[PDB]
Structure 1
Amino acid sequence: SHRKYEAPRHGHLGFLPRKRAASIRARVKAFPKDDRSKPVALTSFLGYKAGMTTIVRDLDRPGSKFHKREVVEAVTVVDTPPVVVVGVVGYVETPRGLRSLTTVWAEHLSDEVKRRFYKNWYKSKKKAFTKYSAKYAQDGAGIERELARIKKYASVVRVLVHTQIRKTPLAQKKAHLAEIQLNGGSISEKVDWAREHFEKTVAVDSVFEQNEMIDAIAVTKGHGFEGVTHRWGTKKLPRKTHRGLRKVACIGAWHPAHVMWSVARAGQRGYHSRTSINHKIYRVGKGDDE
């Protein structure tokens, strides 16, 4: 028979599976649509979430009861030391999707960015990009060829960048390496931009301007194995419940003779990849500035 009283289902089925994300660093699943007219620009930056604080600002909303009145607002501070450009990637579009045809790296790579490629860094010969550096050190001996390949092909160009973990006050010493898509001009112009910025450090103000509405992509806080009551927010069973109350009582009907995917079950909570949109930049503050 039917449900006696209608209630909305617990949880969102579009955020499934509620498993641990593949890594700490959440990737940009999709970049802004490309427009050739706009200048070549980074579409992303990498920061380290430091903490939250409070700001007070005069709200300007013509019609709210708090128009031209002070409002207190929570804010998040992301420490964003300038990220170094090391290498670029070209993506040729195929009837199976975007495929990277080649990746050209920079002449010299930072010790943190090779620590990224290592795991037992101290017990290592640090042989990393040594033969690539030998391939380098000339005008176009083997680098102008790869750049010309990316110019002739690779309708989508992404630049490889890494964070300055040493500047950031953590204990990691292992830079975070990522790609940011260049979303302006021609493919040749994007490759020109990447070449010019090889081994150059880009600051956050160049890409993000105040009062912008940006997205944050990150892996949420992990909370380990969780019961269904907190993992899905299901109703708690009454106090006099034998064998437990932080559970879902009926996890399925007799038929189909299976537990459905849409029934709430205990497991890992948190440490999921998330992309949360429409966060307003309240300030872009400079480090070299008391």
Structure 2
Amino acid sequence: LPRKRAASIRARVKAFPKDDRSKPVALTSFLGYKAGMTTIVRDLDRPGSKFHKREVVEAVTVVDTPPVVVVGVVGYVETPRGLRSLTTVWAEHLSDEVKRRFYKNWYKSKKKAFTKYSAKYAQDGAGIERELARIKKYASVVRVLVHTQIRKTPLAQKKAHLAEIQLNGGSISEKVDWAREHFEKTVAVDSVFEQNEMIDAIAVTKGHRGYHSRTSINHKIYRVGKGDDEANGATSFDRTKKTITPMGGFVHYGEIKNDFIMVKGCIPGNRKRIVTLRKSLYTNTSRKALEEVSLKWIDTASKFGKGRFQTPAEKHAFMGTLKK
């Protein structure tokens, strides 16, 4: 392949997994921001391997997961020339993150982005509800418009990212009504992704050669960590009350007070990068897919140097008191 640079730093999802209309209406991908890498102790459950029922130490990558919010939908009708959106539907109240995304000079603009669109709910909704019933009627496939809570993130960019997600639940009408309830509300990955899920990662890699869109597939999610948990770094074996945040935090990133996904292996791109987490394009059954992993211990030490503790309470407990 000719190595030309990426178009956008938010990499495109060129293909989505297959629509099952017998499952409830649910998302198919997510956009998070990778914090960094650490090392996880767990037990291997692999008969046929000599390392069966044996402690393995594994490199993982953790992506910060702010809860994503839906602000619009887009229905595509089939043409003999390809997919084409007949329209897009927006919600009324959109944040300055998203109105910032449309603008290049937000700091001096009069911020006039979706003003007259807000007059479209000043009415009963007749044009808007006509459009919703149109996307019920036409537009065989449905994509939803989502953006992240980037202010809840140590990113210096206050401008959140918008993306489309193909909605592979059932019933296009129930899909657009589902999105209609889910306008301006939130969706966490706990209703979308789960433990042991084989996911694919779509991300622009590290420029220096580089800065190319890459899709690395078949990565087992190891932890769907909740933001309210203070035992994010804990296990049933590791009974410390500690977070997933490293000692000193993630290097050049900040922290994760939000939800997070800890996934096996490595991933294209660097830290501070927008990464799409897509579920698998097929039902992998490789027994590397079916594995219900069970963690044991989480490294949360410093990568800012050769770390030697996990909690600072452990640090004071070993070092005792100081002169300071």
Match of residue 74, structure 2, among 89, 97, 104: 89
- Residues 254-282 of structure 1: per-residue CA shift (max 9 Å, x gap): xxxxxxxxxxxxxxx11000111100000
Query: What is the aligned partner in structure 1 of residue 65 from structure 2?
Result: 80
Matched, 1:275 2:215: yes
C-alpha separation in 1, matches of 2:125 and 2:102: 26
Identity of aligned residues (%): 100
C-alpha separation in 1, matches of 2:167 and 2:148: 17
Query: What is the aligned partner in structure 2 of residue 56 from structure 1?
Result: 41
Query: What is the aligned partner in structure 2 of residue 135 from structure 1?
Result: 120
Query: What is the aligned partner in structure 2 of residue 210 from structure 1?
Result: 195
Match of residue 147, structure 2, among 162, 181, 184: 162
Query: What is the aligned partner in structure 2 of residue 65 from structure 1?
Result: 50
C-alpha separation in 2, matches of 1:32 and 1:170: 30
Query: What is the aligned partner in structure 1 of residue 100 from structure 2?
Result: 115
Matched, 1:287 2:230: no
- The alignment of Structure 1 onto Structure 2 pairs a total of residues equal to 230
Query: How far apart are 1:140 and its partner, in Å?
Result: 2.3
Query: How far apart are 1:45 and its partner, in Å?
Result: 0.7
Instruction: For residue 38 of structure 1, give the secondary structure of its aligned residue in structure 2.
Output: coil
Q: Relative contact order: is structure 1 or structure 2 higher (C-alpha 8 Å, sep ≥ 6)?
A: 2
Query: How far apart are 1:48 and its partner, in Å?
Result: 0.1
Match of residue 109, structure 2, among 109, 124, 136: 124
- Residues 80-119 of structure 1: per-residue CA shift (max 9 Å, x gap): 1101101000000111111000001001001101111111
The answer to whether the Cα contact below 8 Å between 1:81 and 1:204 also exists between their aligned partners in 2 is: no
Query: What is the aligned partner in structure 2 of residue 254 from structure 1?
Result: none
- Residues 226-283 of structure 1: per-residue CA shift (max 9 Å, x gap): xxxxxxxxxxxxxxxxxxxxxxxxxxxxxxxxxxxxxxxxxxx110001111000000
Instruction: For residue 45 of structure 1, give the secondary structure of its aligned residue in structure 2.
Output: strand
The residue type equivalent to 2:25 in the other structure is V
C-alpha separation in 2, matches of 1:37 and 1:137: 37
The answer to whether the Cα contact below 8 Å between 1:91 and 1:156 also exists between their aligned partners in 2 is: yes
C-alpha separation in 1, matches of 2:182 and 2:194: 20
Matched, 1:175 2:160: yes
- Residues 198-238 of structure 1: per-residue CA shift (max 9 Å, x gap): 00111111110000001100000002xxxxxxxxxxxxxxx
Q: Provide the TM-score with structure 2 as the length reference.
A: 0.70
C-alpha separation in 2, matches of 1:140 and 1:157: 20
The answer to whether the Cα contact below 8 Å between 1:136 and 1:142 also exists between their aligned partners in 2 is: no
Query: What is the aligned partner in structure 1 of residue 4 from structure 2?
Result: 19
The residue type equivalent to 2:39 in the other structure is T
C-alpha separation in 1, matches of 2:211 and 2:13: 16
Unaligned 5+ residue runs, structure 2? 231-324
The answer to whether the Cα contact below 8 Å between 1:90 and 1:100 also exists between their aligned partners in 2 is: yes
Query: How far apart are 1:139 and its partner, in Å?
Result: 3.3
The answer to whether the Cα contact below 8 Å between 1:107 and 1:137 also exists between their aligned partners in 2 is: no
Moved over 2 A (4+): 137-141
The residue type equivalent to 1:123 in the other structure is K
Instruction: For residue 192 of structure 1, give the secondary structure of its aligned residue in structure 2.
Output: helix
Query: How far apart are 1:163 and its partner, in Å?
Result: 1.0
